[PDB]
Amino acid sequence: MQEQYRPEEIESKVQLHWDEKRTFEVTEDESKEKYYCLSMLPYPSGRLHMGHVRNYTIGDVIARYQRMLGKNVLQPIGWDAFGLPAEGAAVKNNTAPAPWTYDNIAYMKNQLKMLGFGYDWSRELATCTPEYYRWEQKFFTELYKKGLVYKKTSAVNWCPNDQTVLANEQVIDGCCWRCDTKVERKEIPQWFIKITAYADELLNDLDKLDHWPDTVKTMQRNWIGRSEGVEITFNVNDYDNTLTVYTTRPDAFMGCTYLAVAAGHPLAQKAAENNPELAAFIDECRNTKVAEAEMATMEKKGVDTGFKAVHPLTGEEIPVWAANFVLMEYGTGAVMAVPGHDQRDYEFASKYGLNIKPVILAADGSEPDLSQQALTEKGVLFNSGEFNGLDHEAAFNAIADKLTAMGVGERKVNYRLRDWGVSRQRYWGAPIPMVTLEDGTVMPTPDDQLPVILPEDVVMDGITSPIKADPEWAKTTVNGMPALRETDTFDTFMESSWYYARYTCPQYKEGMLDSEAANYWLPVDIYIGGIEHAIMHLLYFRFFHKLMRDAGMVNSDEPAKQLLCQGMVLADAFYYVGENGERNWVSPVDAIVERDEKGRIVKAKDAAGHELVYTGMSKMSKSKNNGIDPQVMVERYGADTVRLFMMFASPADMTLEWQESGVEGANRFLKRVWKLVYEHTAKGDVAALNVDALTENQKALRRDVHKTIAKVTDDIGRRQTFNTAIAAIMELMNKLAKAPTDGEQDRALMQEALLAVVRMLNPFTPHICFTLWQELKGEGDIDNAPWPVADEKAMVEDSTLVVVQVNGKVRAKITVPVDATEEQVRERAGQEHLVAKYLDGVTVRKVIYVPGKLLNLVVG
RNA sequence: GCCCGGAUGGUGGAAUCGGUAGACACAAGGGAUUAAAUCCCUCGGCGCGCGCUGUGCGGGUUCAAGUCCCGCUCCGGGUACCA
Ligand SMILES: CC(C)C[C@H](N)C(=O)NS(=O)(=O)OC[C@H]1O[C@@H](n2cnc3c(N)ncnc32)[C@H](O)[C@@H]1O
Numbered sequence: 001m002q003e004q005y006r007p008e009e010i011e012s013k014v015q016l017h018w019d020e021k022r023t024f025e026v027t028e029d030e031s032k033e034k035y036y037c038l039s040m041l042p043y044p045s046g047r048l049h050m051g052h053v054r055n056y057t058i059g060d061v062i063a064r065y066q067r068m069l070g071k072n073v074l075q076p077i078g079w080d081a082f083g084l085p086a087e088g089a090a091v092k093n094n095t096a097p098a099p100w101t102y103d104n105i106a107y108m109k110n111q112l113k114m115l116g117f118g119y120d121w122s123r124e125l126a127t128c129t130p131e132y133y134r135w136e137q138k139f140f141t142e143l144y145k146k147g148l149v150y151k152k153t154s155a156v157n158w159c160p161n162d163q164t165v166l167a168n169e170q171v172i173d174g175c176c177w178r179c180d181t182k183v184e185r186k187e188i189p190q191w192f193i194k195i196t197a198y199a200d201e202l203l204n205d206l207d208k209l210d211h212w213p214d215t216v217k218t219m220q221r222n223w224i225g226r227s228e229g230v231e232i233t234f235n236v237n238d239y240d241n242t243l244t245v246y247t248t249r250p251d252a253f254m255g256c257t258y259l260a261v262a263a264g265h266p267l268a269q270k271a272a273e274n275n276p277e278l279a280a281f282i283d284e285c286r287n288t289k290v291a292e293a294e295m296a297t298m299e300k301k302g303v304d305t306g307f308k309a310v311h312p313l314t315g316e317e318i319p320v321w322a323a324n325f326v327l328m329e330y331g332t333g334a335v336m337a338v339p340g341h342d343q344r345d346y347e348f349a350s351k352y353g354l355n356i357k358p359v360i361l362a363a364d365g366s367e368p369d370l371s372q373q374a375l376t377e378k379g380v381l382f383n384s385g386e387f388n389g390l391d392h393e394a395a396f397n398a399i400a401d402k403l404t405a406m407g408v409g410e411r412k413v414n415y416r417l418r419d420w421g422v423s424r425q426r427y428w429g430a431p432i433p434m435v436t437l438e439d440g441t442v443m444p445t446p447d448d449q450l451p452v453i454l455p456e457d458v459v460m461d462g463i464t465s466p467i468k469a470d471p472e473w474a475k476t477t478v479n480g481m482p483a484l485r486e487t488d489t490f491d492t493f494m495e496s497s498w499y500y501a502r503y504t505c506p507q508y509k510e511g512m513l514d515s516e517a518a519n520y521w522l523p524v525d526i527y528i529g530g531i532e533h534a535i536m537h538l539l540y541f542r543f544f545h546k547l548m549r550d551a552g553m554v555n556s557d558e559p560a561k562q563l564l565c566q567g568m569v570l571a572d573a574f575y576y577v578g579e580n581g582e583r584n585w586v587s588p589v590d591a592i593v594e595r596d597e598k599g600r601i602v603k604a605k606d607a608a609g610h611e612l613v614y615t616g617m618s619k620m621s622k623s624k625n626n627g628i629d630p631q632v633m634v635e636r637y638g639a640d641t642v643r644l645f646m647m648f649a650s651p652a653d654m655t656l657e658w659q660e661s662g663v664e665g666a667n668r669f670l671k672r673v674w675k676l677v678y679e680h681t682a683k684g685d686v687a688a689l690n691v692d693a694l695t696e697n698q699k700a701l702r703r704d705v706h707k708t709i710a711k712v713t714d715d716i717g718r719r720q721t722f723n724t725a726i727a728a729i730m731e732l733m734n735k736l737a738k739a740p741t742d743g744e745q746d747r748a749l750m751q752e753a754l755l756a757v758v759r760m761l762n763p764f765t766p767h768i769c770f771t772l773w774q775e776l777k778g779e780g781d782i783d784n785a786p787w788p789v790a791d792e793k794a795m796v797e798d799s800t801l802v803v804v805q806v807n808g809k810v811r812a813k814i815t816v817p818v819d820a821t822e823e824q825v826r827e828r829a830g831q832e833h834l835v836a837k838y839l840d841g842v843t844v845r846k847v848i849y850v851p852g853k854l855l856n857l858v859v860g
Numbered sequence: 861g862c863c864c865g866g867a868u869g870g871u872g873g874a875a876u877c878g879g880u881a882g883a884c885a886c887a888a889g890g891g892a893u894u895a896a897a898u899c900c901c902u903c904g905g906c907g908c909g910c911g912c913u914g915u916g917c918g919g920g921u922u923c924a925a926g927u928c929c930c931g932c933u934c935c936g937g938g939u940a941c942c943a
Pocket residue numbers: 039040041042043044050051052054055080496528529530531532533537566567568569570619620621943
């Protein structure tokens with residue numbers, strides 16, 4: 001051991017040891033108890049950023065902690081390798097998506113290995129390889145055969161000039177991010193999976209996930225959006241078809257003063273013939289963006305269609321209006337409006353002079369004031385014919401029954417949850433295994449033809465997909481005749497919905513899963529990934545587990561026991577507009593910045609001379625170009641310092657604004673730990689510790705040692721508050737550095753304490769701890785060393801601290817024996833001069849005593 | 861807009877079940893060795909071995925509120941084709 005901590009001469013050395021010994025390679029060992037510690041797998045974007053480092057350090061801490069408790073820990077890594085970013089990058093750099101992606105994988109693989117994360121590299125997966133995607137292809141055809149896949153027309157962002165489809169991200173400030181011309185809605189036929197078929201199972205099973213946080217569970221309930229309501233059908237005067245709507249408020253049905261229909265609705269299209277105002281409005285509606293965000297923030301607009309629907313209970317003619325917020329793809333493409341008791345309908349009817357009829361009494365039984373807003377709260381009906389005086393419940397059922405008996409209403413459960421559209425019109429994805437035959441029929445690709453391989457040796461024009469552009473590729477032969485296979489590819493979430501299961505048997509060729517290996521490792525003990533995925537990915541992931549259960553492939557009903565959603569690591573983001581309207585994101589490293597009195601960024605320019613637009617703190621990613629690569633710091637201070645600093649910055653679940661300030665604190669701390677072990681071990685082998693024999697100074701220190709063990713164990717195992725676990729270990733090191741080390745008993749206690757500090761610090765900083773454990777002459781490699789256990793006898797307290805307050809304000813703090821009574825504490829508190837100061841001339845009215853903790857004398 | 865979070869010294873954060881506000885660190889200033897590195901001292905505000913005040917803003921509950929309740933501002937995540 002050298003005097004100086006030299007990370008550069010340790011980490012690479014210890015990393016190689018792990019590779020050669022295959023330390024973190026695991027099999028399905030029936031002797032050991034299993035623990036599956038999964039971190040969400042990275043997209044190979046180029047380099048890691050600190051977001052990645054936070055995810056994979058949290059993973060590694062739990063992986064190493066649980067290994068040290070004696071478990072067989074699976075910690076796998078792989079690459080979610082299909083995606084959009086590879087297409088625009090490959091074009092711009094004059095490559096194809098496949099080689100760009102595999103380069104990134106190698107680069108990042110190397111970064112991950114330099115951070116020292118104990119992965120089972122034997123189980124490494126790439127989702128873009130046909131050894132992987134063939135199985136989801138096979139699976140999709142089984143899903144079709146089971147009736148869980150259908151095709152329908154769906155809205156996509158379409159560039160009419162280029163004839164390309166654009167993702168929501170690629171549409172910016174209305175126009176496209178390439179050049180200046182409008183982006184329009186185009187309904188295009190596409191493949192969906194009936195996730196709504198499992199909506200109730202997905203909804204109900206959230207009540208079983210008591211180790212998933214409520215942030216995630218509540219977000220998921222609200223996303224699925226289960227409601228029990230009524231579908232209602234209206235005849236329309238001079239139109240042969242009917243209009244069907246869905247309401248959850250059939251109690252306010254008598255205050256329905258108009259209906260609102262989509263721009264795509266045939267009734268709107270029929271009326272557009274003779275109504276040029278409406279025809280212009282429908283044509284305008286193609287500019288509406290395919291994104292909920294923009295559709296709720298846009299100004300609510302509409303035109304009268306001229307068609308009058310018959311209200312089935314009053315018989316009154318009510319106008320049908322075409323509106324820009326009602327859409328054909330979702331639901332019936334028509335809704336009913338009750339402006340008196342729906343605020344969105346109130347705003348619409350106010351703007352266009354439509355009738356605002358009241359039908360719900362206020363809580364006191366008064367007719368409501370609808371002069372500033374709608375009465376959204378439920379109540380008794382008035383102005384409702386035979387339904388007057390009925391409360392909410394009875395009104396719901398009465399109107400439902402009457403509408404059912406008339407044969408124009410039916411009760412119905414609805415979900416906000418729409419089905420999962422898996423079609424993408426992009427090159428870099430697994431091809432969808434469906435086929436169109438010469439005779440017009442559509443069916444799954446036959447099993448003998450799976451996988452449908454995506455060619456990698458291609459030339460990209462950026463506009464069209466190589467497999468769509470070349471008409472030879474689609475040609476196959478099925479049932480004896482010519483067929484054309486699908487040129488659309490799968491949504492990239494398809495590969496990330498079952499990777500966790502494939503990790504248990506990645507080289508298995510006979511099927512999707514080896515169910516012996518899958519049932520040994522599943523379900524996942526802890527799943528670690530960003531709060532960004534709370535809804536979309538986690539929901540698909542849970543849905544896909546239920547599909548594989550229904551194929552008899554897995555045992556569990558849910559895929560993951562515990563879920564730890566870390567906060568986002570944020571950074572400042574800047575851009576400038578280019579010479580044809582293209583956003584160009586600049587890194588915060590390359591941006592000269594001038595700040596406010598409050599610390600806010602007020603001016604920003606790049607090194608060249610472009611006035612930058614500052615968008616704010618947002619998540620680190622390659623898209624906004626605001627990601628900080630760890631590679632520079634790792635080579636400066638070492639991986640252990642970078643890791644410790646990340647874990648010490650903030651509790652895992654809280655979102656972090658990244659800053660370089662603080663790294664030295666971790667670097668210095670590790671130098672202090674190194675020093676203390678250097679000095680202790682230079683003095684040689686130590687005597688055995690004599691417990692019953694220690695002085696009161698020695699007894700007190702050993703209490704703090706064993707209390708750190710208990711607290712750190714709880715802080716990692718239960719709370720996952722690693723920052724407080726490190727702070728506890730740091731405080732013990734300051735105690736240990738001030739302790740005497742002369743006597744045989746002092747050196748024996750220092751041994752016990754350092755053996756324990758090094759093990760507690762190992763999950764965080766495993767390289768330095770691997771080395772230090774050998775210097776302290778610990779048994780074996782620290783990776784398999786047992787986790788230290790606190791000793792109840794060493795932790796027993798002889799006194800406790802009581803806080804003394806007068807009318808809630810702290811006036812003194814006293815040490816008192818643990819077994820002390822209220823009367824003794826009062827008498828001891830009275831002896832304090834600052835307590836007596838505020839008891840003079842006043843009476844003690846009330847006393848509050850929290851045992852061993854607090855006394856409040858309520859005085860006046 | 862809608863759903864979910866968050867805000868504590870110059871800075872990141874601690875306070876685990878409503879009971880000590882600022883643990884543990886960073887930055888800064890001062891001193892000690894001799895520039896680096898190391899080690900001490902000081903460090904929420906306003907006026908002292910004291911007093912008041914102080915956890916984004918406005919109210920309220922309580923013996924006691926960073927914490928609970930009612931109303932807000934700002935900032936982040938998702939909002940179904942970024943992953
Ligand atoms: C399962 C599949 C859908 C995952 C998908 N392939 C994927 O997300 N890939 S990834 O490279 O972008 O990220 C990998 C992990 O790291 C987290 N993360 C990413 N950015 C940040 C950030 N700025 N801050 C904090 N965490 C971040 C992220 O949530 C994920 O758990």
